[PDB]
Structure formats: C-alpha cells, structure tokens
Amino acid sequence: RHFANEFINRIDELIVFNRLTPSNIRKIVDVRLKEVQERLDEKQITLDVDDKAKDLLAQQGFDPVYGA
Amino acid sequence: KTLCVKELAAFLFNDPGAIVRIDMSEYMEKHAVSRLGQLTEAVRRRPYTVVLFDE
C-alpha cells in the first residue's frame, strides 16, 4: 500500500524475515566463535568453549524487540 | 490492463519499449498542470509512442 500497484509486480521475491526463535539462539553464538578463533591462529592461541558457556549467554542475550 | 498496453506498442509500433508511463498517484494538487512538462517532453523524442495513465 505504501508503493504502487505496478512496482510490487517487478519484484522477484518478497522474502519476509521472521522473529528469532529461542531454539535458534544456540546456533547464533556458534558463528561468533569462528571469527574469534581465526584471529588468534596467528598468535598460536587455541580458544575452547565448553557446553556451559554457550547456554548461559543464550538465555541472557535473547532480545526479540531488537534481534541479535 | 498492463499486458494489453505492451501488446499494442509491440505490434503497431514494432517496439517493446518506449512506453511513456505517467503515474497519477502523486499528481493530486491544483498546480499539477504545469509539471505535465513531463508528458509533453516524453513524446517529443519519439512522436510514435504510447501513453499510459496508471491509477
């Protein structure tokens, strides 16, 4: 309704993003740990995360009205 | 209402393009007779075109 009736027809796909579910929060911190390990490889520093650090940061970083 | 306009220009003029699209969704003022100008200069380059009025 904000644009025109002929402008919405030229768009190929109308991908609508959804809300970040609490079950997908565990997979969010798994991506951030990859960027940290690749930066410490030049200094020969191995970073390891147990199964307790990812669970605590998942329940505290949940913010649906702002995202990640 | 849209495919029929492109069909007339592709047969009577042998050109799929060169379609003057004038949207009236924004020209809703008393001073809209001076900016249309846009319609007078759109057909000046090619006198054998089509005119479309959307909304």
- Taking Cα atoms as reference points, which of B41, B51, B46 lies closest to residue B8? B51
Long-range contacts of B43-49 (CB under 8 A, 24+ apart): B46/B18, B48/B13, B49/B9, B49/B13, B49/B18, B49/B19, B49/B20
Which residues of B have a CB under 8 Å from any CB of A?
2, 21, 23, 25, 54-55
C-beta separation of A24 from A60 below 8 A: no
Please state how this structure was obtained. cryo-EM
Q: Return the residue of A nearest to B3 by Cα.
A: A6
At B38, the amino acid letter reads: Q
Q: Do A4 and B2 touch (CB under 8 A)?
A: no
